[PDB]
A paper describes a structure:
The [name] vectors are composed of non-enveloped T = 1 icosahedral capsids, consisting of 60 viral proteins (VP), and package single-stranded DNA transgene cassettes. The presence of pre-existing neutralizing antibodies in large portions of the human population poses a significant challenge for [name]-mediated gene therapy, primarily targeting the capsid leading to vector inactivation and loss of treatment efficacy. This study structurally characterizes the interactions of 21 human-derived neutralizing antibodies from three patients treated with the AAV9 vector, Zolgensma®, utilizing high-resolution cryo-electron microscopy. The antibodies bound to the 2-fold depression or the 3-fold protrusions do not conform to the icosahedral symmetry of the capsid, thus requiring localized reconstructions.
For the sixteen 2-fold binding Fabs, this strategy resulted in maps reconstructed to 2.54–3.56 Å resolution. The localized reconstructions with C2 symmetry relaxation confirmed that only a single Fab is bound at the 2-fold region. The epitopes for the sixteen 2-fold Fabs comprise VR-III to -VII, and -IX of the AAV9 capsid. Furthermore, for all the 2-fold Fab-complexes, movements occurred in VR-IX near the 2-fold axis. While, for AAV9 capsids in absence of Fabs the residues 704–707 adopt the same conformation in both symmetry-related VR-IX loops surrounding the 2-fold axis, there are numerous variations of side-chain orientations in the different Fab complex structures.
Residue numbers in the entry:
A (entry chain L): 21 to 131
B (entry chain H): 20 to 143
C (entry chain C): 495 to 542
D (entry chain C): 689 to 736
E (entry chain A): 349 to 435
F (entry chain F): 219 to 654, 670 to 736
G (entry chain D): 220 to 233, 239 to 295, 306 to 435, 471 to 688
H (entry chain E): 419 to 542, 560 to 612
The structure:
Amino acid sequence: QSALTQPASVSGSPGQSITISCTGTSSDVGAYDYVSWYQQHPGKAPKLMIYDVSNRPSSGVSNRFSGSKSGNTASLTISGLQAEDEADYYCSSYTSSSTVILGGGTKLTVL
Amino acid sequence: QVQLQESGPGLVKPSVTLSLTCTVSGDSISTYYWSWVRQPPGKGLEWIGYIYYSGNTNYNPSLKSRVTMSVDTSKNQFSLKLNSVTAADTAVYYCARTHHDYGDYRPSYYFDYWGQGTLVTVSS
Amino acid sequence: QNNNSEFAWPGASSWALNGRNSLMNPGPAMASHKEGEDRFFPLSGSLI
Amino acid sequence: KENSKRWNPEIQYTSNYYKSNNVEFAVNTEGVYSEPRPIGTRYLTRNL
Amino acid sequence: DYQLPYVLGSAHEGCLPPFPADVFMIPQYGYLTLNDGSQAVGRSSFYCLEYFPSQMLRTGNNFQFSYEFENVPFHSSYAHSQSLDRL
Amino acid sequence: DGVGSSSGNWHCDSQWLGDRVITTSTRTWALPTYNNHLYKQISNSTSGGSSNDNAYFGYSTPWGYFDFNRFHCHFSPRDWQRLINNNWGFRPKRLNFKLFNIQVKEVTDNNGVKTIANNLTSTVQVFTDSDYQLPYVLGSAHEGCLPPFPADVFMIPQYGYLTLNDGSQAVGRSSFYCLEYFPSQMLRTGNNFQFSYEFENVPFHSSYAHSQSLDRLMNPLIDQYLYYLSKTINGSGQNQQTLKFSVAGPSNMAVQGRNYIPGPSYRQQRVSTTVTQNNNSEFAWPGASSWALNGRNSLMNPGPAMASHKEGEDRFFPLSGSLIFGKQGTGRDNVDADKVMITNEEEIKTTNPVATESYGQVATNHQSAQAQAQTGWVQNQGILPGMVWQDRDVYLQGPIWAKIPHTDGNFHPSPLMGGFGMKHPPPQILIKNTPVFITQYSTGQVSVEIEWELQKENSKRWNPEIQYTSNYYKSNNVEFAVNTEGVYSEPRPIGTRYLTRNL
Amino acid sequence: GVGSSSGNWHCDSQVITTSTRTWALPTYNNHLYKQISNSTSGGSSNDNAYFGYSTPWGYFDFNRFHCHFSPWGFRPKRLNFKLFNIQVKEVTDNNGVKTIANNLTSTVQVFTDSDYQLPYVLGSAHEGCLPPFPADVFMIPQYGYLTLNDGSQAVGRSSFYCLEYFPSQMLRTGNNFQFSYEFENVPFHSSYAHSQSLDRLMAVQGRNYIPGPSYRQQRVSTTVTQNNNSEFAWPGASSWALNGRNSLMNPGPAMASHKEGEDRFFPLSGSLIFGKQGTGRDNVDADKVMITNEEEIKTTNPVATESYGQVATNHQSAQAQAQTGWVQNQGILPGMVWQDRDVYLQGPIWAKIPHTDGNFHPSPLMGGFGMKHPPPQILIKNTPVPADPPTAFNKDKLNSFITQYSTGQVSVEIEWELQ
Amino acid sequence: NVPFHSSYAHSQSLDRLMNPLIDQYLYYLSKTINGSGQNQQTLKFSVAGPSNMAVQGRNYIPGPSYRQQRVSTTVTQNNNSEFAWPGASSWALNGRNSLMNPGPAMASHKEGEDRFFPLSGSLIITNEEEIKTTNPVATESYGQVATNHQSAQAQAQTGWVQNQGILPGMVWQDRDV
Amino acid sequence: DGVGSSSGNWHCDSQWLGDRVITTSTRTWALPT
Amino acid sequence: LINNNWGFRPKRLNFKLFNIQVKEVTDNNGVKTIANNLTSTVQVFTDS
Amino acid sequence: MKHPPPQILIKNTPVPADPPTAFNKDKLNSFITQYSTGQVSVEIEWELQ
Amino acid sequence: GVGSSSGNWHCDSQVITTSTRTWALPT
C-alpha cells in the first residue's frame, strides 16, 4: 500500500535526546503494533533497532534507542546522542493487506 | 551466525529479466521467511517481497505483476526474478531474513539479518 | 490469499440437530495445517 | 514422568531473552495482568 | 521399556527361515523420524543404542530372557456357516 | 576367570532419583605402546625452544591414563538439558571406575601386509595414584577424554609430566618419577579391574542467574536515612564553596549507601567479532593481560570470573577472558572465528564487573583552594571486605574438577576454568602394556559411574523462566546427532545457567 | 473477641530489649501491583535507570538500633515479634468532610517470608523504621522491589513476584499474630577502641602484621574556604562500575575518617551521614546533618583520604634512580588486620548477605551484622473490600473498592548477648 | 592449634602443571591481522599445546605482590645515590609512614640472579627462593593489565601491576622459618 | 465462631512432591443480588 | 509441568469458602452509603 | 499389542586395529574385519480354543 | 568356557512350539 511518511531530516547536538516520527494510515501503524525501525550507515546494510513498537533486539542495540506509538504515528527516540548515532532511519510497518511497507527515511545529523 | 551472500550481474540491458540468488551460510533456510529489499541510490528502502521454505510467497503489490521468487532448500539458497527491467530497477538489492516463529499465527514483518547487498545497473 | 466473499457462515462445517444447524466447533481433533503451511487455520477447527 | 532415551535435547517452553517495556505474564504500569500467548502442553516427545 | 522405535510390525524380511536347517543373516536395524522432506525438524529425535545397558558375550557366555504376552483375544481360526442377512 | 568368559557388561544409562543423579558411561578404548616401553627426558630444547616463556623440562612415560574429566563424558545432551533446566545446583558425590574385557593383540608385519592375532598370555598394568604422589596432569584441560558419543572408540593419551626447569636445562631440585616403582595390578585377558572413589565435600555449582543486580537491591519506593553531598558550591562566582546534602532516594539510586560491592577485577583487552571495529595491528600477545612467575610470562587465561561484556554488546569478548571451544573437525592452527565457539559469561554481570571495564575510580589527591579533585581508573582490584561474586560457569564440553595446588595458603580455590576444586580430586588412573620387543597393543572396555547431588529450584517467580531449548527448525541434520558420514558433533557450547534466583 | 484485647503493652529493657509501638497501614496503589521504572519516575540518567514493581503490601522495619534501645561486645540471639489489637477503620466522604467508622468484619493479611523468596529490602537502610520514641505512631512503608533492567526496559530474565501467591495469615480485629526467630551465629560486634596502634606494638622495624585495605576517598573540609571552588560532588567521587552503570562507593571499605588532629575533614562518600530532626530532603547545610566519624579505628585502619603506601616502579641501576609510585587502592594481602565500621544508635543492625558463590568478610559495609539468613521480611496489607457490584455480570475484575485502613500494636523483643 | 609449617620446596612450578605431551581442547587468539597493509583485520584462533605453553588455560594463579626495590650486592651496579629511604616500599598509618619490612612473602629474586635482593623484603641476608614456584618475585611487577579499549582508531595499551591484592584462585607459600 | 474472628487464612502455592502436584489458589469474590 | 512431564491428571479437590462479609447499600440522592449487615446470611450448596 | 515381544538388538563389539604410537584425539577409524555366528532358540507357548 | 557348549539344540512342537536356527551377524 501507500508508504509511511517521515520528516526528511532531523538534527541534534551531542548528548541531547531527539525524536523521529513516522505517520501512517489507520491500516498500518494505526491498526497494528507491528512497527520496526532500521538504522543505516552509508554503504552498508540496514540494521534492525526497534521491533514490535518498543522492543529492542537482544544484542547490538543500546538502551538509548526507544520506540513508541500514538494513534497513527510511531516515533523513535534517541537520547545521549553520539557521533555513531548519525545515520539514516526507516520506519516500517505491516499493513492491512498483509504486505510490508516502509517509510521514506530520515537523515539525522549530530552537531 | 546466519550470513547472507547474494550474487548476480552488475549491468543489465532493458527489457531483460533479472535473476539473483542469495546463499544462507552458517544456518539453514529453515522455517524463516526470506525477503528481497532494493534501495535505489539516494532513495528509501523498498520491500520487494518474501518467500517461505514451502514456496508460499507474498509480494509488493506495485511490483507483483512482474516478480517471481524461488527457494531451493537443498542448495540452501533462494532467488529473485524480475521481468522487463528498466531505468527504475537500478538499485542495491539486499536479501534479508524475516523473523518468523513457526507454529503461531503472527505476521512476519521485520528483517533481523541482512545481506551485504548487490548493485544492479539497468542500462543500454 | 482468501476469497473476496462472505463465507464465515456459508462455508462452515456444521451439524444439524432437530432441524437447527450448529457450527462444528472445534470438532474432532485434527492437525490445524499441513506442514510448511502455518498461515492457514481451519475455520472453526481451532480454539481462539 | 518421561524416561525417554532421546539423545538430542528436546523442545522446551521458554521465555525469550528479550528487551521489552513490560515483562511477559506480569502487570503493566497500570496494574493490568495479561497472558500474551496461549500455552499448550506438548513439548516433550515420544516414540509412536 | 519400549524406548526405541519399534520396527518389528512392518512385515519386513529377516525372519528366521521356515525350514529349520537354513542359516539366515540377521537384518540391520534402522529407524525413521519426523521429516519435512529429506530434511529434519527440531522435533526429530536421534537414538543411540550404545546408551542402553547391554550384556557382553564371549564364546562361552549365553543369553536368555523370558517374556509374558499380554492378554489378547483368540484370533478366530474359523469361517461362519451362516450369513448376517439370512439369520 | 576364563578366556572365553566376558569379565564385565556394557553399562550406559542415566538414572534420576529425587535429589540425585547417577550417570554411567562405557567406552571402547585402545592402548598402544608409547616410547617403545621407554622413559625419555623431554624439553623445549628437543624442539629447539626459541622462547623463555615457553621453556620446559620433563619426562614422557610408557604409561597411558584415562581422562573422563569433561562433562560430556558423563551426560548426554538431553540429560544435560534435563539437569540445567530443573536445578539450582549439582556436585559429584561418588565415583566407580571399572576396566574389563581386556584384549591384548600382537602385531606381525610380514612382507607386504601386516597381520594381527591374539596374545592370550600377555598382561596389562593398571593402577591409581591415591596418595597423589605423582604430578597431577588431569586438571589442565587436555584432550583425550572419553568421547562424548558412546559409539566412538577412543585412543588413550600418553602420560607425561614437567618438573622444575632453568631455561631448558634441569636443576638439582627437580624430581624424576618411575611409575614402575608403584605397585600395580596386572591383568590378563580374563581379569578385570575396579576401584571406587568418594569426592570430598564441595559447594554446589551455581546453575542459576540472579534476577537482581548488586546495585539495585533497594526498595524503589522509599528513601534512605543517609545523606550524600550534593553541592560543593552555590554557583558561578568566586569563593562560592558550600556544603549541601540531600537524602538518597528512588530518584538518584547511584549515590545510595550500599552494604555490598562487586567482585574483584583484572582487566582484559576487548576484541570485536566484527573485524573492522578492531584495530589494524597485531596485538594478540602484545596487548594481552598476563602475570609473571620467576621470569616467565603466563598469559592470564581465562582468569578471574568477570562478565564478558556489558548488556547489549555481544560482539565484544575479552582477549584471553573466555573459554573457546573448537567445532567438530576444526584444525589445530589459525582457524577462522566461525570454526570456534566462544563462550560468554553474560549471566554474572549483576554481581561481577565487566572483564573489559575498569573496576571504578579512586581519589588520587587532596583537593584544596589551590587544587581540583582528581581521580584515576582502577584497572585491577583485589579482594575487599564485602565483595560478592559468581564463579565461572560450567559447560557440557568443559572441565569438571581440578586439583587444588598444595600450598600454605589459597583464597577461594574454585578453579578458574570452572568446576569443583578439590585438594583430593579423583585419582589418576595409569595404564600400560607389559613389555614382552614384540609389536603389541591392547584394547578393552572402560565404564565410569558418577553420582551427582542436586539442589532443587524452590522459586516463587510468577512468570516463566528461560529454559535451554532446541527451537523448531528444519535443517539437513539433527543437532547433537550424527550426519550421513557418521560424525557426531556438538553444535554449540551449553552453559548451566538458565533458572534464576534473587540476589 | 470483638471487645477483648488480644495483647498488652511491653516496653522495657532488661540483655532483653522489648519495644512496642502503634502503627497505621493505608491502602497502597488501590490494591494493585503496578510496574514502575525510571521512565515512570522521569528517567534520563543511565546510572539511575531501574525496573521493578510497587506492591499493595506494606512491611515492618525494626532494623535500626534506636528501635530497641532507649538512650566490649554484643550481638543478637533470639527474636520475638507480635502483632495484636488490630483495628480496621473505613472512610466515607460526604461532600468534603470525611467519616471514620469501625469495620469489624474486614481482615488484615500478614506473612513472614522465612524461605527468603522475595527480594530483601531491609538491608538498604531506608526510612520507615519503628520510631525511636515509644509514644509516636508511625506509618508503615510500602513494599516494592527491583529486578533486572536495561535502561527502563525489562530483560527476559527479569522476575515478577506476586505476594498474593504466598500463604498468609488473615486477621480480623480480635486476632493477633506472632512468630519467633533464631539469629544465626555472628561474631560479637566489637565495642572498644584499641589502646595500642598497629605500628607501635621504629619506622624501619620488622612487623608481623600490616593495616587493612583501602580504596581512597576524596577529602572534604568543613571549613569551606579550604575546599576547592568547584563542583566535585560527583566528578571527584569514588565509584564502582557494574554492567556499565557507575555507582558511588558509599560508605565503602572501613577506614579512619581522618588523620590524627584533622577532625574537620570527612571522606566525600566515606562516612555515614544522618539527618537531624526536621532536616529537609534536599540541599541542606552542614549544620543540619550529623556526620559520623571513623577515627576510632585509625590504629589498625588507614585514613580513608590517604594512600595506602608506596611501591617500587622500576629496577634501579647506576643509570637509573629508584622510583616509587603511590598506592591509592590496595586489596587484601596476607598479614592484614582491620576493624569493621562501628554501629550507631541510629544505625542499622543487620543486612542480608547476597546469595553468591563467594564473598569475603561478609560484614556489611554500612555496619552491622551480616547474616545469610537474617530476620525475615514481615509483609502486611489490608484485604480489599469491594463496593456494590453492577448486578449484571461483568467479566472484568472489580476496580471500585471501599476506602479503608487499619491500625494496631507491634512488639519486638530481642535477647542480646554481651561480651 | 596451628597448621603445620611447610618445610619443603615444590618440585613443580605453577605455570608448568600441564601434561607436556597433549594439546588442550581450548583455543586462544593467535593472530589479529593477515599481514601488513590497511584493513588487514582478522581473528585467527589456535589450539593451546606443548609448543606454546604461555597461552594455555590455567586454573590457579600466583599469590599477591607488593613490589620491592631491587638491590645488588655487587656495589657498582647500584645507582650512586641515597635511595635507601625514598626508594623503600612503605605503608602509611595515622600519618606515620612505616617501612614494609619484611612484608608479603615473595621470591627474593629471579632464578639465575642471586646477587639481587628485595630492599626491605628479606630478613637480615637470607633468600626466599624456594617459593619462586608459586610466588611472584619481590622485585618484579605482578603482571600486565589492559588499560584501554582498542579500536580501529586506538591501539591496545597495557599498564604494569606493581601491587596485586588477593584474587580468587591464588595460591602462595608463606615465608620460610 | 464470631464477628471478630477470622474464619480462614490465605493459601496460594504449589507443592511438587514425587509424581503429584498440589496447587492451591485463593481469590476474593463479590456476589451481587 | 509441561517441560518435565509426559502426562498429568487431577486427583482430589478441596474447596473452602470463608471470611464472608455482607454489605447493605443505602442510596440517598447522589451519595450512597455502604455498611455492614451483621445478621445477614449467604446460601451456598453443591449439587453432588 | 501395547507391550509386544520386545526388540532384541545385537552387534559385534568393535575391535580396533593397532592404533598409532603417538597420541591423536580422533576416533579410531580402523578396525579388524570381524563377524559372528551362533544359535537362536525361541519357545512360544500357545493357548487353544 | 571355550571347549564346552552353552546350549542344546531344541526343535520340537508339543501347545508349546520350539524353534532353533543358526545365524550369522556381520558388521
